[PDB]
Symmetry: C3
Subunit: 285 residues, 3 copies
């Protein structure tokens, strides 16, 4: 099928922690991360980018699910301009998308990143998930204008979905979000490491990855991994099943990253919200 996707490059204030501290973000659609894009393998994506008239910078769009021309297709457009391009999603899995404007380190760091999920055309290629969650790791830099600090990898926090300990109510009493599932259910994590710079060594504390799929591709399946290494600009699908009620903590096991905000708690309970990890709730905002 043919799907139409329109995103707006918007420069606006967004929250980055649980106390409501704000940041001068650059975004797709006024939020960090950008909207989840979801298509089926083989679908035609008609993409439109609108750079908001109030933006002070040129912006662009790069989909890792696209096979196109970097020069013409991923070109930067000025505030007030609109760009269109079309691509087929040739490969199933999970893919990073981000602004490709100069310099990419800053456009990514300021929040212009998201995920495109490409469901396999074969519905039985992956085992059936009972829950799905999107987690996108990124480094947070204190001064969004300081490109030197970014080049030197001097981040202040490492976060999931734009927030320091956004999903950790165990550590942070001010955290208001967490992942939910029932014991025995297959929880599918769509993970993207946006970077811009750092690696992620993703581990579920008190659990194990049942299956891991590099780039989300069913052909690359690995089994029963305690940890999985996701480079900057890479993505994977990771399945998790708890045999008991309680919690796991999804962490970047590079402890300095974890202690800086990269911990997401999943609660396994018999009374899990039936709407959690389903429909529009896969990226918890």
């Amino acid at each position: 099928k043919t799907v139409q996707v329109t995103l707006h490059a918007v420069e606006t204030d967004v929250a980055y922690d649980n106390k409501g501290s704000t940041y001068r973000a650059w975004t797709f659609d006024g939020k960090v991360p950008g909207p989840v894009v979801r298509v089926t393998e083989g679908d035609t994506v008609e993409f439109t980018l609108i750079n908001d008239k109030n933006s002070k910078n040129s912006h662009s769009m790069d989909f890792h699910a696209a096979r196109l021309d970097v020069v013409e297709d991923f070109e930067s457009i000025k505030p007030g301009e609109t760009k269109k391009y079309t691509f087929t999603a040739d490969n199933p899995g999970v893919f990073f998308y981000h602004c490709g404007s100069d310099p990419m380190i800053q456009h990514i760091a300021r929040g212009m990143y998201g995920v495109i999920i490409v469901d396999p055309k074969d519905a039985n290629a992956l085992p059936k998930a009972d829950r799905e969650y999107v987690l996108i790791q990124a480094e947070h830099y204190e001064n969004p204008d300081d490109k030197t600090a970014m080049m030197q990898n001097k981040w202040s926090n490492v976060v999931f979905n734009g927030g320091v300990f956004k999903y950790d109510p165990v550590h942070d009493s001010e955290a208001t979000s967490w992942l939910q599932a029932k014991p025995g259910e297959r929880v599918r994590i769509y993970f993207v490491n946006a970077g811009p710079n750092e690696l992620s060594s993703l581990h579920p504390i008190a659990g194990i990855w049942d299956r891991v799929y590099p780039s989300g591709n069913p052909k690359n399946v690995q089994y029963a991994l305690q940890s999985y290494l996701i480079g900057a600009g890479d993505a994977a699908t990771l399945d998790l099943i708890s045999p008991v009620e309680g919690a796991n903590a999804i962490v970047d096991h590079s402890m300095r990253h974890a202690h800086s905000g990269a911990i997401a708690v999943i609660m396994f309970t018999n009374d899990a919200d039936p709407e959690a990890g389903r429909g529009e709730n896969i990226l918890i905002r």
Copy 2:
């Protein structure tokens, strides 16, 4: 089968180099790394942690081989307290274990780490090994109380099994340990990267990894790798066979790590000690 495993959280002085320099370590059973734990896939482990009465800190236990509740099972216990929990080793391979107390970065860095080996139930899943060796990489931090330096990744050394160049008699004439095998023998390395922060790019100088198993699982086999990337908090099983007498040097190929202590020499000779890499000698102390 059901086995019983008791470990003691002990805060004590241990040596970290070949000239007998000491460190105020936090340990399992007064040694770094902790005792090797070894079970068969499917086994029930009845675990007991005793926090020594002389400890000044709360401690805990996290097994990557366990599927439990992070909140209740991996909880911290005070000096003088005893905690018990039970888990089944559901998956074969090699798994990181460590203290999960606040902050994990420091508890790991000070020496509270080890390995649990889970032998496959199918005795023919892995090719028969003639030697087995445990190698655990960690960063050594000069001041064990300086949590800031740990957060900033300012380590002094990168070590195998708690010692700077512990297994490198070629470079350090004061080194008294090395790995042993005969030419043609299959040497199985159980490798754990304890971190807390850094990645390991493991390479046998003058050799090649015959086979590598991510998380030690037979299902994930990769062949003839010159190097293998092990993230912080990850583990793998790596097989090595030398066709000749001589030496290989197992290194973290990120050279700054290798030069800071991450080199382990394996000697291939016809007169190799029949006790080496067998029974109780797999982690050479």
Copy 3:
């Protein structure tokens, strides 16, 4: 078959950017990277190293394709000396070679590195490539004599084949080289991360890796990867096919690396040079 390979350890000035800035390099055969060595699986390599009489340092040779003795075979030789050793290339793929002299961090960083390609004995193990290109990543350090800066990972640039933005005429107007292919052709990238310290997260902007082979081995094939992580001292074979005319940009997706020089443009055109990526032109100098 038996092949004879002679390399000279030569200390000489080489260019490292597009304005002809020079560096006091340590090299094999007066160039960075060293000459491409290419053999067939099972071949016998009779290797000779000649340390140039005017060298001020001892040098050596370490092939990741060799299974030998680090002590005797990879030993350092003085200026004016000649060393010989023989090895069989037992495993097919792509392998790092470098000087193994003290300290390796500096010998690698100053330019003593290259690639050995070992073609599979089974000519149908890999799909047929229409183009082949060698790309070797390394960190460039401003002061070649400053070993502390190297140990602290304080590089100035991250480069492909010894040059800052060597293959990026889109960004740098002074760049005179780029990769070439026609749409629909299978482009095979032989990639080596020489380091000495850093990891590479390799991604083709506006493309996807059709196939990736860890250590270039056909047995380890992975499919449709947006990115692939190559540790320091590791190598991989990565296949790329563009369905359209235009360009892809091969980048280390850790953005601070890319912005510091790690970007190589491949141009897909109907009028691509029939000599490009073939015969003697696989490593573009």
